[PDB]
Amino acid sequence: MRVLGLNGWPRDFHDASAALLVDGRIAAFAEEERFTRKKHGYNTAPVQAAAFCLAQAGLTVDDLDAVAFGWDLPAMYRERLGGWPHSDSEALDILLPRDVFPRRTDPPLHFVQHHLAHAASAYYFSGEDRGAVLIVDGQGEEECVTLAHAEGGKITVLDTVPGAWSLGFFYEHVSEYTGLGGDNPGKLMGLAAHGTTVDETLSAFAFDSDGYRLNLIDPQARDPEDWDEYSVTERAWFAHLERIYRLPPNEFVRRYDPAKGRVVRDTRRDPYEYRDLAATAQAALERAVFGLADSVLARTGERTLFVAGGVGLNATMNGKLLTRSTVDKMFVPPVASDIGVSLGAAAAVAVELGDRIAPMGDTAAWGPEFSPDQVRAALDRTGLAYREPANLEREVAALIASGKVVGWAQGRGEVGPRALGQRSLLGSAHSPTMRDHINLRVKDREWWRPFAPSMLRSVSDQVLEVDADFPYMIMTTKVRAAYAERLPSVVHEDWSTRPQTVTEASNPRYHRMLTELGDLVGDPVCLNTAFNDRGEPIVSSPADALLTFSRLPIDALAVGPYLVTK
Numbered sequence: 287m288r289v290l291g292l293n294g295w296p297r298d299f300h301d302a303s304a305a306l307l308v309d310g311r312i313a314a315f316a317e318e319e320r321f322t323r324k325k326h327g328y329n330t331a332p333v334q335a336a337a338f339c340l341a342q343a344g345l346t347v348d349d350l351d352a353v354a355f356g357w358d359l360p361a362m363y364r365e366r367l368g369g370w371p372h373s374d375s376e377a378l379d380i381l382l383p384r385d386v387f388p389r390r391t392d393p394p395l396h397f398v399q400h401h402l403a404h405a406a407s408a409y410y411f412s413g414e415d416r417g418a419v420l421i422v423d424g425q426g427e428e429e430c431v432t433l434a435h436a437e438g439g440k441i442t443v444l445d446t447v448p449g450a451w452s453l454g455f456f457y458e459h460v461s462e463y464t465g466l467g468g469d470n471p472g473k474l475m476g477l478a479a480h481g482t483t484v485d486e487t488l489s490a491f492a493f494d495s496d497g498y499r500l501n502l503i504d505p506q507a508r509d510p511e512d513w514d515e516y517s518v519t520e521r522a523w524f525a526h527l528e529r530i531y532r533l534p535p536n537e538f539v540r541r542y543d544p545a546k547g548r549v550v551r552d553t554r555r556d557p558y559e560y561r562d563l564a565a566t567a568q569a570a571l572e573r574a575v576f577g578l579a580d581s582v583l584a585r586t587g588e589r590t591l592f593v594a595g596g597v598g599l600n601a602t603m604n605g606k607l608l609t610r611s612t613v614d615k616m617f618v619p620p621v622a623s624d625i626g627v628s629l630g631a632a633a634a635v636a637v638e639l640g641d642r643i644a645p646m647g648d649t650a651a652w653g654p655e656f657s658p659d660q661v662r663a664a665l666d667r668t669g670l671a672y673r674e675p676a677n678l679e680r681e682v683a684a685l686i687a688s689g690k691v692v693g694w695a696q697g698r699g700e701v702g703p704r705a706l707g708q709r710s711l712l713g714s715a716h717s718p719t720m721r722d723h724i725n726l727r728v729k730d731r732e733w734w735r736p737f738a739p740s741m742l743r744s745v746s747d748q749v750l751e752v753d754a755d756f757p758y759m760i761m762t763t764k765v766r767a768a769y770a771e772r773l774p775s776v777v778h779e780d781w782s783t784r785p786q787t788v789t790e791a792s793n794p795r796y797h798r799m800l801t802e803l804g805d806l807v808g809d810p811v812c813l814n815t816a817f818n819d820r821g822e823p824i825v826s827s828p829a830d831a832l833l834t835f836s837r838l839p840i841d842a843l844a845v846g847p848y849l850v851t852k
């Protein structure tokens with residue numbers, strides 16, 4: 287079967303994406319934002335991403351067996367908006383506009399419950415036949431947590447937690463409160479590391495062996511003037527935090543900056559000031575989630591844990607789950623967030639149609655790639671001088687070993703928020719100055735942001751305490767003592783790191799470059815951070831890569847078989 291899975295809608299939506307499954311395999315998968323260059327893919331059908339998927343596979347909508355959407359959108363309209371006005375034909379015209387998606391007839395349209403879509407995106411791609419399912423996000427249609435059992439191809443729901451008790455909303459709100467912003471929860475996690483926790487209940491949470499309770503909010507609290515509990519939870523958490531925390535909300539400042547020639551948005555206070563609140567929010571999230579995970583594992587009698595939902599992006603939390611006595615094996619897909627529900631909806635529908643779903647297999651490289659001709663065209667546009675190195679991987683290795691920063695745009699763009707050797711900025715893992723260089727000099731951002739390493743799978747056993755695959759940078763683990771001081775730019779003081787393990791199959795070129803690097807500095811390990819400028823998504827096209835390379839003090843750009851230097 288050929289099934290196109292979708293997420294993103296013109297009203298009140300985020301993280302639009304499209305995914306095409308062909309006989310259980312990911313033919314193509316991408317986020318709208320990569321194409322629009324507007325972060326988070328807000329308020330839009332995944333028009334461009336779906337266009338890419340079809341082009342990639344050489345299909346039209348007429349070749350599709352089914353279109354799948356990762357929310358029960360009709361039910362949300364019926365419940366929260368007084369009616370679902372669309373025929374399937376009309377919904378399709380909105381999801382796949384005819385001026386972009388010509389069709390003789392309509393494919394069967396499927397709506398998949400939001401948390402089932404999340405769960406499917408983990409279970410079916412994990413390479414494991416059974417496990418316990420833990421979905422934690424902001425909110426699906428109703429619930430904010432789902433506990434389920436995955437076995438024999440089936441996902442069976444055991445329990446849910448209602449939206450008002452959302453751990454995702456809680457976290458966003460704290461992130462917003464600190465001035466980091468609700469749209470950047472990942473920064474809050476980064477900041478938590480520098481703080482100290484006093485009272486992990488925040489005077490709101492009560493914890494138990496199966497999870498948590500939120501006394502701050504009626505669990506059945508509901509917004510009659512919207513279709514999720516975001517605003518209701520926002521007002522409760524903001525009143526509460528101002529009451530118990532020493533600092534009031536950090537305020538956003540909008541002012542004309544004569545250096546930039548623009549009104550820019552800033553914060554009234556340095557958010558580093560809220561590090562204790564971050565630390566505390568992070569401890570609370572961990573505690574709540576440990577209980578939930580323990581609970582679903584015991585109830586199902588599994589020792590494999592699947593996690594998805596936006597909270598699943600909390601790599602710090604994931605790593606501690608991993609080391610938990612109740613967990614043997616863990617799988618969290620790179621696309622744990624809503625970007626993943628397109629793929630999840632496609633899977634749930636393809637499985638329903640008798641398809642067998644292949645494992646992701648240690649790669650998230652499903653987006654667009656570009657031929658040498660296509661890269662060369664973009665280079666000739668700029669008029670910039672460039673070389674075509676006989677051995678690019680070796681030259682890149684030497685650049686990195688010497689302490690230089692190298693843009694690396696190769697192969698199919700990765701999907702998800704993490705750069706993984708297709709659209710990365712590369713630098714020395716061994717350099718005790720590289721972190722400040724990239725944070726301050728290169729990305730002109732916060733000194734306290736952490737960096738993470740890519741390493742050959744074939745050495746990770748010696749480098750890391752756990753001999754497992756870590757293909758996605760979605761899970762933190764500790765390094766072994768023989769490496770806990772060798773890699774200062776990618777390893778914290780507590781010896782923790784958020785690694786990508788690389789196999790030769792998953793990424794031959796990158797694997798080769800890492801190999802060369804190893805001969806130069808001993809360890810086939812580098813710093814691998816997102817290839818983007820503040821306020822843009824990861825670069826996608828060669829023109830994107832050139833544009834960003836041009837405005838950042840990077841040393842080189844390896845784009846396709848070409849090298850460009852500054």
Ligand SMILES: Nc1ncnc2c1ncn2[C@@H]1O[C@H](COP(=O)(O)OP(=O)(O)O)[C@@H](O)[C@H]1O
Nearest residue numbers: 423424425454455458471596597599600623624
């Ligand atoms: N690193 C992180 N740590 C904790 N929570 C996170 C992190 N990244 C995302 N989230 C949470 O995921 C939530 C949204 O998840 P998602 O499933 O993508 O959308 P929705 O909740 O609308 O279905 C946000 O409220 C956010 O707090």
Ligand SMILES: [Fe+2]
Nearest residue numbers: 423595596624
């Ligand atoms: Fe979600």
Ligand SMILES: [K+]
Nearest residue numbers: 608609610613
């Ligand atoms: K364990």
